[PDB]
Amino acid sequence: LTLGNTTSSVILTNYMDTQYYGEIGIGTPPQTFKVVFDTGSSNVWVPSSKCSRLYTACVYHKLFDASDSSSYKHNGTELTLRYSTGTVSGFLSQDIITVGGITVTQMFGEVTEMPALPFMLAEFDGVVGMGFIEQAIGRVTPIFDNIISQGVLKEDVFSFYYNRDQSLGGQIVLGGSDPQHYEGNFHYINLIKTGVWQIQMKGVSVGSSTLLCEDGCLALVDTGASYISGSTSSIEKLMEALGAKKRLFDYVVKCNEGPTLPDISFHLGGKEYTLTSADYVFQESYSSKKLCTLAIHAMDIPPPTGPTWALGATFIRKFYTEFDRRNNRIGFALAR
Ligand SMILES: CCOC[C@@H](CC(C)C)NC(=O)[C@@H]1CNC[C@H](C(=O)N(c2ccc(C(C)C)cn2)C2CC2)[C@@H]1O
Ligand SMILES: *[C@@H]1O[C@H](CO)[C@@H](O)[C@H](O)[C@H]1NC(C)=O
Numbered sequence: 300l301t302l303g304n305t306t307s308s309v310i311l312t313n314y315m316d317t318q319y320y321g322e323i324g325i326g327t328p329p330q331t332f333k334v335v336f337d338t339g340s341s342n343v344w345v346p347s348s349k350c351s352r353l354y355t356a357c358v359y360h361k362l363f364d365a366s367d368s369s370s371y372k373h374n375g376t377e378l379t380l381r382y383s384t385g386t387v388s389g390f391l392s393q394d395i396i397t398v399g400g401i402t403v404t405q406m407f408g409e410v411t412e413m414p415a416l417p418f419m420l421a422e423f424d425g426v427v428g429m430g431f432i433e434q435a436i437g438r439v440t441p442i443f444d445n446i447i448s449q450g451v452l453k454e455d456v457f458s459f460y461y462n463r464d465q466s467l468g469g470q471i472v473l474g475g476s477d478p479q480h481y482e483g484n485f486h487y488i489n490l491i492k493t494g495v496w497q498i499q500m501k502g503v504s505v506g507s508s509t510l511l512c513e514d515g516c517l518a519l520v521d522t523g524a525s526y527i528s529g530s531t532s533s534i535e536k537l538m539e540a541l542g543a544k545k546r547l548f549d550y551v552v553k554c555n556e557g558p559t560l561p562d563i564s565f566h567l568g569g570k571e572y573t574l575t576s577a578d579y580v581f582q583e584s585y586s587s588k589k590l591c592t593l594a595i596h597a598m599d600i601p602p603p604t605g606p607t608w609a610l611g612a613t614f615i616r617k618f619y620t621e622f623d624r625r626n627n628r629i630g631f632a633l634a635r
Contacts, residue, residue, distance in 0.1 A: 300625070301450025307399035309336070311461070312422075313468030316581070317525040317595070319461050319612060320423040323473065324397035325407070326368030332361050336459075336471055337523025338496045338622060339609065341435035342380055343396070343442055344348040345425035346566055347389055347409035356418035363392075378408045378437050383598055390413035391437065392494035398427070399473060403446050406439045407569045418486040429457065429522060429622070433494030433595070434604075446473060447624070459522050460634060461615045476630075482617035485630035488568035493627050495604055501566040503533070503608075505540040509566070513626050517607035518567065520620060520629050524611025527579065528598035532610070535597070537563070543593060551590040557582050563595075565610065572631065578617050 309321040312333075320333045325345060332345045337524075348364040350357035358627040365371045372393035379388045389410040396405040410425070428441055435441055447455055452474030460470040460480040469475060476485075488498040500518040503511035511533050529537065534550075541560055544551040552560065560576035581592045600606060621630035 300447065300455060302455070303449075303451040303454060304453050305451045306453055306472055306478065307401050309399040309471040309472065309473070310467065311336075311469030313462050313464050314422040316371075316464055316601050316612065316616070318422050319469045319522075321399075322551070323427060325363055325393045326365075327370040329397055330361070330367065332363070333422065334425045334427045335423045335523050336429050337521070338425045339519060339521035339523045340380070340426065341383065341428035341430035341432065341441045342378070342408055342437075342439055343405055343420060343425070343427050344378075344380060344387060344389065344410050345409035346413055347411050349409060350389075350411045350413060354413050355415045356413040356421070359419060360413070360421070361424045365392060365394075365409065366588045367401040368394055374406065378439075380408065383600060385417045387414075387418075391439065393413055394523045395546075396442065399453070399471070401446055401473065403442060403449065405442055405445055419611055420590065424610055426523065430496060437627065443473070443624070446573070456621055456623045458621045459615055460619050461612050463616050474496055476619075476621050480635055481631050482633035482635045485621055485632045486570050487623070487626075487628045487630045491517070496622060496629065497607065498567060498605065498629055500608060503529075503537070504562075504564040504571075505567070506561040511536060512566075512608070515521075517605075518565070519609040520614075520622070521609040521611050522607045522615060522620070525594070525613075526611050527558065527574075527595045528600075528609045528611065528615045529595075530599055530606045531597040535594065537595065541593075544590075549596055550593045552580065552593065553587055554582070554584045554589040555587040557591045557620055558585075562624040565608075565614070567631070570631075571619060572614070573604060574617060579613055590625070
């Protein structure tokens, strides 16, 4: 590992508190794409001009045209990326990617199959996986590993700031942290193992009692996830305690009850990470005649990573997060 004296920041747009995306340039001249930076995955992909227009998501998104890039290098190996929310399929290509001023030669997926559900709901075009090579489909070197290889970054770390919505939507710092977006000190939690941004969780409290994860559990710290998620079983118990009602894809409370809900605490490392109802309820009205969604849902993550909780944007909004590759740990500080 070679270290430089450079930090690079990526400005993010906050779409409805669920999607936080930045811009990347691909090829020569650059073709620009809106992308989510996801610590829960390790591949880079954007939709391809080779995507049949029968996929309406390809009609509505920006497409990479290899035929317009003089720096493109063919590969063609088939790739399928199976996310918990949906799947994309396509093939590998190589080109120059610009992210926050840094330019890097990167192998990425050109997606030719992009299902209308959920991708018609994506404000972003593609994803930049911020995970480790161990989780990369096709053993493709992830972009942060390629950026580290350049020996320009001051530190082998990257940090996320997600705003709560003229205001900055969010910010990723490659090579450091931005003290303008946090306060107090970082408290670090070591990874269970290298290869996954996952830490041990010692308990989940709903009110003053630890009713969940009593004997310990896992927490994936997932920047690409919109919500906090737990297994169906853990979430059924959490929601029972909140008095929330299960719907198809989410949980709801009567809008008037939203401000009465208890605090939820996540026991990580030596500290309690507390969210008040204002942090996890999408409070759209105070009406006793309307239902308000919660920013916590059930998601059964399969083994070897799962069963696990995932601390997505709901969590990161309250806690500025540093992902430390040099020391295999995650730091949290109160977001400012
Ligand atoms: C196979 C490569 O994936 C690895 C896998 C491992 C996990 C389960 C531990 N990784 C994952 O499953 C991802 C982990 N991080 C959140 C991601 C996400 O939710 N996405 C998402 C967000 C919004 C929408 C909208 C269109 C509403 C669609 N997708 C984006 C990455 C696509 C995926 O769940
Ligand atoms: C695609 O990249 C892999 C990885 O190095 C390589 O082994 C393979 O030969 C490439 N395929 C083509 C056709 O370029």
